[PDB]
Design a binder for these strands. Structure first.
Ligand SMILES: [Mg+2]
Length: 223
DNA sequence: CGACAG
DNA sequence: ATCTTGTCG
């Protein structure tokens, strides 16, 4: 499954950031109306200090049926640095993406999207490469301010960057902590919340695209 | 000084 | 993310 290599990955943090500020300029926060047919999810596990195993799950909507699953295990050199995750989990994902045969209508990542210090989280960054609509679903905050929603099964609040709306916090499960949703590329707030609320079966905290992509991500690190 | 996706 | 088993609701 093709894509566009917009630049090189091995860059000292400082350049990587200049790359991000430049890229943020090509983001299209357009709407996504209508229901999707094919929906994928991405995640990475780490079998070794510097070895990561990437995994992509493509699902049939709304039957949530698993139509295809590819992977790619490899070396990881760029260290983890809040705000620069794309330069870590990004390359190995693209290696797995090449093995994919079904065309996703929208891919969903395990990390921020618009809710990033420079408005370019891994979700944003990858959408630009593979030019498909993307969303970012994270389990903790990185950027933006909000009002912790009620602990009621479907409550929610908006994620702000001042007066600007950049995402939203949803409590998809009682007793458990909220998730952080924000648009990648070719996507907007009101749409992502809609869709994400749609991909989360009752009783679970995390949506199926990512919740399965993770399971395989850990499992493949063993049996 | 604090904060800081995975 | 990862180190780790049982245990509490
Ligand atoms: Mg992960």
């Amino acid at each position: 499954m093709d894509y566009r290599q917009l630049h090189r990955w091995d860059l000292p943090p400082e350049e990587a950031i200049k790359v991000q500020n430049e890229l943020r300029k090509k983001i299209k926060l357009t709407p996504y109306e209508g229901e999707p047919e094919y929906v994928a999810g991405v995640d990475l596990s780490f079998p070794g200090k510097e070895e990561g195993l990437a995994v992509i799950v493509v699902l049939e909507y709304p039957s949530f049926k698993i139509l295809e699953v590819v992977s790619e295990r490899g070396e990881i050199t760029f260290p983890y640095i809040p705000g620069l995750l794309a330069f870590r989990e990004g390359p190995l994902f693209l290696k797995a993406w090449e093995k994919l045969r079904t065309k996703p209508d929208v891919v969903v990542f395990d990390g921020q999207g618009l809710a990033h210090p420079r408005k370019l989280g891994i979700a944003s960054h990858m959408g630009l490469f593979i030019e498909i609509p993307t969303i970012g679903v994270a389990k903790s905050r990185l950027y933006g301010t909000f009002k912790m929603p009620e602990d009621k099964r479907c409550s929610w609040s908006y994620l702000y960057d001042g007066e600007e709306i950049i995402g939203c916090v949803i409590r998809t499960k009682e007793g458990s902590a909220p998730i952080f949703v924000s648009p990648g590329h070719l996507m907007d707030v009101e749409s992502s919340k809609r869709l994400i609320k749609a991909f989360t079966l009752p009783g679970r905290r995390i949506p199926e695209p990512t919740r399965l992509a993770h399971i395989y991500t850990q499992r493949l690190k063993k049996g």
